[PDB]
Amino acid sequence: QLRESGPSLVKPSQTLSLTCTASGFSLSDKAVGWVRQAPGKALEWLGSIDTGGNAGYNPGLKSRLSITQDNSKSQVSLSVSTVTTEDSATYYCTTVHQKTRKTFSCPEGYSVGYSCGCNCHGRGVYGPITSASLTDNYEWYCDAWGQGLLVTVSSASTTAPKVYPLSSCCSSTVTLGCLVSSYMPEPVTVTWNSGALKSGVHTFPAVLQSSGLYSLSSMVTVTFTCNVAHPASSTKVDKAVEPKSC
Amino acid sequence: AVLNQPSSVSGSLGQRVSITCSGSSSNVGNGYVSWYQLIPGSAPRTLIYGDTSRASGVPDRFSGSRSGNTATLTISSLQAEDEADYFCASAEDSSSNAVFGSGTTLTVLGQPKSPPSVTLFPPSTEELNGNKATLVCLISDFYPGSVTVVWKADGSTITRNVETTRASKQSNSKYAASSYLSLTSSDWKSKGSYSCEVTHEGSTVTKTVKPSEC
């Protein structure tokens, strides 16, 4: 389990700082990388820091990126300086497989000789026979992936939500709900009865109002309490929902 | 700067589809392409590494290949859970510099259709005490994921102060959506009827709240 921690809202032209740790494991013996995805765009490589402490970065973003470790290498940090609205993205922490091998290579239409450790055999401009070259082969892929942390770069400030109970007016199934209204930024988490409700719960994706605060709703098809958590504002509301007496 | 993938790929259940990944000699041409599967609500999952090697737990219906500067991810038999965004990737000039593909949204057709379930919630007493009134129309369990929502009040269509989300896939593989009618408290009490009309595949499911009984 990889966990990214840090703020979900950062003002423009400031520095975004994120930390990655592992639960169940240790990042000290593994290479750790950072990947982000802006809404409706492709995944983008940021950089990594291998077991040897050496950091590598996306060349187009190197001048704004800083990926560091601590003494134990148990936690890995990412810094993005001078952020703009284009830096709004979900940021993922990953473990990365990185190995550089040196193998003999040959030009087009040539193959390496048997059990060489070396000349190449084929047909081409080099002749029938030519000496092989030692070339670095780059092995790279992201192994484990964190859940990702959504970061919004915006001038708007934090806004705690207002939680309203939802109940039908005056049946086969009684449907209740909770309206998480006018909050900033994303996300919010919603559970019911402290997670004791396993099925029948539907939490809907948030809408962004002409205003500019988000709003979402969660509903249960059956006392019932929705546990609304907005970690950005350190808000936790457990709203009791009771159907109308009538 | 980015490997080229088709914007979207469609296929029906049990059919074979392929997703290509077009790069250059500097990345794909070196023969160590990886593939990743992004399902909403879940962490990204690595499917393939080293062009053809499958990650742990990945079904054998996923396979990878490469011809020159284009690599391919192949799903031999489509399943509904395979609906996701797929990304290829490769290192470039170093084991720390990597480039991802542009992404391919995969859709699996042929799933059973289903009408939307509609629930319309009136404003709560607490919100009404703040001189505001939000009507909440929750739409779920429909396939395909296309729905048209219309708000009405005493027989007249309401076009202002309406916010509707796009359809999003649920855990049971059908789609969900929600619509909001943000009114003032006095507006909510002025009309005698409010309706959320949800049209899906030519069929309309309507729910109505009457302020006189809420």
B209 touches chain A (CB under 8 A): yes
CA distance B80 to chain A (A): 20
A194 token code pair: 């402290």
Q: Please give the Cα distance from A150 to A37 (Å, whole number).
A: 9
The answer to whether A53 and A71 have CB atoms below 8 angstroms apart is: no
Q: Please give the Cα distance from B211 to B206 (Å, whole number).
A: 17
Q: Please give the Cα distance from B12 to B51 (Å, whole number).
A: 26
Q: Please give the Cα distance from A124 to B29 (Å, whole number).
A: 20
The answer to whether B111 and B78 have CB atoms below 8 angstroms apart is: no
Q: Are residues B185 and B136 in the same domain?
A: yes
Residue among B97, B140, B176 whose CB faces A56 most closely = B97
B131 touches chain A (CB under 8 A): no
**Segment 89-118 of chain B within 8 Å of chain A by CB:** 89-103
Give the C-alpha distances (Å, rounded to integers) separating A87 from A15, A26, A64, A194.
11, 28, 11, 34
Query: Taking CA B103 as the corner, what is the angle to CA B98 and CA B109, rounded to the nearest 5 degrees?
Result: 150
The answer to whether A4 and A148 have CB atoms below 8 angstroms apart is: yes
8 Å CB contact of A165 and B94 = no
**In which domain, by residue range, is B1 found?**
1-110
- With b for 16 or more beta-carbon neighbours within 10 A and e for fewer, the B21-36 pattern comes to bbbeeebbebebbbbb
Residue among B46, B134, B136 whose CB faces A142 most closely = B46
The answer to whether B83 and B107 have CB atoms below 8 angstroms apart is: yes
Q: Are residues B120 and B103 in the same domain?
A: no
8 Å CB contact of B93 and A138 = yes
Question: Tokens 């559970």 correspond to what residue?
Answer: A191
8 Å CB contact of B165 and A206 = yes
Q: Are residues B105 and B143 in the same domain?
A: no
- Residues 6 or more apart in contact with residue B4 via CB below 8 angstroms: B20, B21, B22, B23, B101, B102
Q: Are residues B101 and B129 in the same domain?
A: no
Q: Are residues B193 and B126 in the same domain?
A: yes
Which helix (H) or strand (E) segment holds residue B188: the answer is helix B185-190
Q: Please give the Cα distance from B17 to A148 (Å, whole number).
A: 29
Give the C-alpha distances (Å, rounded to integers) separating A138 from A101, B33, B181.
7, 11, 55
8 Å CB contact of B180 and A215 = yes
Q: Name the domain boundary from B62, B77, B110.
A: B110
**Backbone phi, then psi, for B28, in 5-degree steps?**
-60, -40
CA distance B61 to chain A (A): 20
Amino acid found at A5: S
Q: Are residues B125 and B207 in the same domain?
A: yes
The answer to whether B61 and B37 have CB atoms below 8 angstroms apart is: no
Give the C-alpha distances (Å, rounded to integers) separating A68 from A54, A94, A158, A179, B23.
9, 14, 28, 41, 31
| Method by which this entry was solved | X-ray
User: Residue B166: which CATH number?
Assistant: 2.60.40.10
Question: Tokens 């060349």 correspond to what residue?
Answer: A59
Q: Are residues B198 and B143 in the same domain?
A: yes
In this structure, how many other beta carbons lie within 10 angstroms of the beta carbon of residue A128? 10
A60 token code pair: 């187009």
Neighboring chain A residues of B30 at a CB cutoff of 8 Å = 137-138
Q: Are residues B34 and B76 in the same domain?
A: yes
DSSP string, A148-208: -EEEEE-SSPPB--EEEEEE-----S-EEEEEEEEEBSS--EEEEGGGT--SSEEEPPPEE
Q: Is the dihedral of CA B35, B39, B40, B41 positive or negative?
A: negative
Q: Are residues B118 and B138 in the same domain?
A: yes
Task: Count the domains in chain B.
Answer: 2
Q: Is the dihedral of CA A9, B170, A206, B9 positive or negative?
A: positive
CA distance B122 to chain A (A): 7
**Segment 30-49 of chain B within 8 Å of chain A by CB:** 30, 32, 34, 36, 38, 43-46, 49
Q: Please give the Cα distance from A244 to A221 (Å, whole number).
A: 16
Q: Are residues B98 and B141 in the same domain?
A: no
Q: Please give the Cα distance from A57 to A136 (Å, whole number).
A: 19
Q: Name the domain boundary from B63, B87, B110.
A: B110
Q: Name the domain boundary from B88, B110, B132.
A: B110
**Looking at the domain covering A162-241, what would its CATH class be?**
mainly beta
Q: After which residues is chain B broken (C to N over 2.5 A)?
A: none
